[PDB]
A paper describes a structure:
One of these proteins, Acidic Mammalian Chitinase (AMCase), is an enzyme known for its ability to function under acidic conditions in the stomach but is also active in tissues with more neutral pHs, such as the lung. AMCase is a member of the glycosyl hydrolase family 18 (GH18), the members of which hydrolyze sugar linkages through a conserved two-step mechanism where the glycosidic oxygen is protonated by an acidic residue and a nucleophile adds into the anomeric carbon leading to elimination of the hydrolyzed product. We found that mAMCase has maximum activity at pH 2.0 with a secondary local maximum at pH 6.5, pointing to a bimodal distribution of activity across pH.
Across these different datasets we observed complex ligand density in the active site of mAMCase. While modeling chito-oligomers into strong electron density, we observed strong positive difference density between sugar-binding subsites near the C2 N-acetyl and the C6’ alcohol moieties. Using the non-crystallographic symmetry (NCS) “ghost” feature in Coot, we were then able to observe that the positive difference density between ligand subsites in one chain could be explained by the dominant ligand pose observed in another associated crystallographic chain, suggesting the presence of a low-occupancy binding events. This observation led to the discovery that GlcNAcn occupies intermediate subsites, which we label n+0.5, continuing to follow the nomenclature established by Davies et al., in addition to canonical sugar-binding subsites. This unexpected configurational heterogeneity, which is observable because of the high resolution of our datasets (1.30 – 1.95 A), likely formed as a result of equilibration between the two anomers through an oxocarbenium close-ion-pair intermediate. By modeling GlcNAc2 as sequentially overlapping ligands in alternative conformations, we are able to visualize each step in the proposed catalytic cycle of mAMCase.
Numbering used by the authors: 22 to 390
The structure:
């Protein structure tokens, strides 16, 4: 099994104990580390932070402590949008220019591959032709990587992609049978399945549907999403299950109505380190649990939730990570990916569960070390 761990280049700016840079990573936890994010300019891959070159070096220097580790650079992300991707894939010339820039950039800075994080082909302004042109881009990139390996006598660069977990986005975005032939791994974003945007409480990454859900609400679970990818053409061994090391928060409209599906208002509370309404890192969750919160096991969905007065949290813990890890092995998936290692209790100072408790749980369950 593989354990793919995302690192984010803005975690460095969090205050105090939240500040996280590549030297905070334990290099033996994961099989692959992915650096989020690179950008694009003039159809070529580029940096986005003033000190990315420094952080790239610290990141790829982690391979000096773990000889089996591979690193990848992710391009895109949510806030990147779709416009640069649409322009880049629109012509063979623009695609060859991008691919050429990627080979040079990855080799120069010491990366072993590229993770495509276009959110999403065919959605968010991307026109319908981008579904097929994404396949063309990946096929051409895979072919170019194969040839560069022969020419340079080095192991081939990997091409992977982070892909939608929402069914409407999947249907608009991906030619799954053909795309799956050329990708090395498919990182399915089986999280953000519920959140304050819905107006009621729900779990960030429930394994199974809630018993009362019918129709399109029943898409919103790990089991459905992973099996959608598998049964529409993706090989199980290339499919990587997304594991969030964070939870989504809500403000309850009536604190006495605090179950799954209880009505909510607004964007949800923010945490002192991540400072974004609706989102708490696992280490911030541990502080909440120590602040008088009630913890509940959502038995049908195999995940926890917790509440305190008007605040409600849907999240993941060691138990739910363990259940889902057993599940993915039983379904013959390729492994797990975590968003994001800088949201784990990397200092060990918040959760009393050791350093990197969630990532360590997957390391152990998947036999990585
Ligand atoms: C591989 C992956 O999950 N990519 C997406 C991420 O971009 C997104 O994280 C968000 O990234 C923004 C930049 O694109 C950051 O500004 C923001 O802080 C961060 N949000 C959260 C909730 O972490 C993750 C989140 O699951 O999912 C994808 O959408
Ligand atoms: C299954 C699905 O498609 N869920 C969607 C959510 O992803 C989305 O939330 C946003 O997800 C981004 C990663 O893809 C994050 O970067 C972003 O922070 C997050 N928005 C939040 C937390 O408010 C929601 C709302 O846009 O839509 C769902 O359909
Ligand atoms: Mg009640």
């Amino acid at each position: 099994y593989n354990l793919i761990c995302y690192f984010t280049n803005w975690a460095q700016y969090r205050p105090g104990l939240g500040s996280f840079k590549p030297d905070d990573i334990n290099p033996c936890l994961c099989t692959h580390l992915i650096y989020a994010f690179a950008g694009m300019q003039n159809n070529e891959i580029t940096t986005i932070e003033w000190n990315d070159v420094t952080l790239y070096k610290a990141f790829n220097d982690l391979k000096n402590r773990n000889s089996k580790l591979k690193t990848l650079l992710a391009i895109g992300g949510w806030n990147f949008g779709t416009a640069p991707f649409t322009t880049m894939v629109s012509t063979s010339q623009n695609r060859q220019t991008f691919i050429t820039s990627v080979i040079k950039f990855l080799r120069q800075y010491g990366f072993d591959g590229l993770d495509l994080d276009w959110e999403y082909p065919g959605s968010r302004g991307s026109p319908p032709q981008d579904k097929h042109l994404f396949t063309v881009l990946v096929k051409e990139m895979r072919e170019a990587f194969e040839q560069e390996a022969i020419e340079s006598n080095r192991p081939r660069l990997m091409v992977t992609a982070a892909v939608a977990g929402g069914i409407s986005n999947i249907q608009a975005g991906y030619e799954i049978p053909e795309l799956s032939k050329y990708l090395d791994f498919i990182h399915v974003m089986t999280y953000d399945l519920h959140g304050s945007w819905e107006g009621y409480t729900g779990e960030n990454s429930p394994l199974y549907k809630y018993p009362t859900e019918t129709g399109s609400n029943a898409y919103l679970n790990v089991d459905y999403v992973m099996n959608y990818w598998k049964n529409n053409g993706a090989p199980a061994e290339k499919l990587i299950v997304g594991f969030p090391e964070y939870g989504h928060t809500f403000i309850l409209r009536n604190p006495s109505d605090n179950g799954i599906g209880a009505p909510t208002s607004g964007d949800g509370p923010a945490g002192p380190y991540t400072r974004q309404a609706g989102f708490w890192a696992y280490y911030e969750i541990c502080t909440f649990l120590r602040s008088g919160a009630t913890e509940v096991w959502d038995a049908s969905q195999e995940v926890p939730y917790a509440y305190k007065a008007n605040e409600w949290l849907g999240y993941d813990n060691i138990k739910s990570f363990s259940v889902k890890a057993q599940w993915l092995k039983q379904n013959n998936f390729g492994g797990a990916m975590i968003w994001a290692i800088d949201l784990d209790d990397f200092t060990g100072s918040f959760c009393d569960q050791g350093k990197f408790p969630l990532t360590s749980t997957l390391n152990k369950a998947l036999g990585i070390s």
